[PDB]
Amino acid sequence: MTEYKLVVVGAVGVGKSALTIQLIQNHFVDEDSYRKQVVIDGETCLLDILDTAGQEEYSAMRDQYMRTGEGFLCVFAINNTKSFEDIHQYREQIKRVKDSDDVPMVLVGNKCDLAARTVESRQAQDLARSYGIPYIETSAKTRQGVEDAFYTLVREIRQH
Ligand SMILES: [Mg+2]
Numbered sequence: 820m821t822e823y824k825l826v827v828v829g830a831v832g833v834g835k836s837a838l839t840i841q842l843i844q845n846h847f848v849d850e851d852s853y854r855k856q857v858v859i860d861g862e863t864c865l866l867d868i869l870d871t872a873g874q875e876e877y878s879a880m881r882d883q884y885m886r887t888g889e890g891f892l893c894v895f896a897i898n899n900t901k902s903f904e905d906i907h908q909y910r911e912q913i914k915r916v917k918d919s920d921d922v923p924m925v926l927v928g929n930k931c932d933l934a935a936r937t938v939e940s941r942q943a944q945d946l947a948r949s950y951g952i953p954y955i956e957t958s959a960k961t962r963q964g965v966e967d968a969f970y971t972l973v974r975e976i977r978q979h
Contacts, residue, residue, distance in 0.1 A: 820856075822865045823973050826888035828909050830902035831873035833894050834929040837959030839870045842969055847960050859973055866969070878912075885916045890923035890976045892968060895943075897928045897936045897956070903943065910950065923975040924952045927968050932958040 827835045840846065843853050851870040856863070869884055885891075893909050895902040906926065913922050926947040928938065940956065947954035953971050957964040 820864055821862065822867055823976055824867050824869075824887055824889040825892065825969065825972060826869045826871065826884060826890070827892045827894060828871050828885075828913075829873070829892075829894035830896075830899070830905045833873075833896040833899060833902045834957075834959050835873070835892075835894050836870050838892070838894065838927070838929060838957060838965060838968070839868055841959045841962055841965050842866075843868070847962075859970055864973075866973075868969075881912060882916050885913055888913075890925075890972045892925055892927055892972060894927045894929050895938070896930045897938045897940075897943075898930055898933050900937045903928075903938045906946070921951075921979075923972065923979050924950070925968055925972045925975065926950070926952055926954045928954070928956045930958060930960075931956040931963065932960045 827839055829835050837848050839853060840848050843855055853868045855866050857866055891913055893906055895906055914920060928943050944954050955964050955968045955971060957968050
C-alpha cells in the first residue's frame with residue numbers, strides 16, 4: 820500500500836507528541852516512530868510518523884530524518900512566541916536538506932484550547948500565506964483539528 824512518511828517538528832514543549840498520540844492512540848497525555856493503517860478519502864494507506872525530540876541537538880542529527888520525510892508538520896504553540904519565531908529556522912532547514920523551495924508542509928498552531936495566547940491567528944495565517952502552505956490550529960487536549968492537520972498534510976503530499 821501507499822505509505823506516507825510524515826515528520827513532526829517544532830520547538831520544545833509545543834505538543835509534537837501529544838498531537839501524534841491523540842491521532843494514533845486517541846488520548847491526551849498530560850505528560851520515536853509510529854505506524855498505523857488508516858483509510859483517508861477512501862484510500863487505504865499507512866501513516867509512518869516520526870515524532871522528533873525537541874532538543875536542538877541535531878542539524879547533523881536532524882538532516883538524516885528530514886531527508887527521508889515526505890511531508891512535515893511544523894508545530895508551534897499559540898502561547899509561545901519563541902516557538903513561533905523558531906518556525907522559520909525549521910523551514911529553512913527542511914528546504915536546505917530536500918533541495919527544494921516547495922516541500923509538502925503544514926503550519927500548525929497547537930494548544931488553541933488555552934486563553935493566554937501570545938501569537939494571534941492572523942499573524943500565523945499571514946506567515947503561512949507567505950510560505951504558500953496551509954495553516955491549521957489544533958488542540959491535542961480537545962482533539963480539535965488533529966485529524967485535519969495530519970490529513971491535510973497527506974493531501975499536500977498527494978498533490979506534490
Ligand atoms: Mg515529544
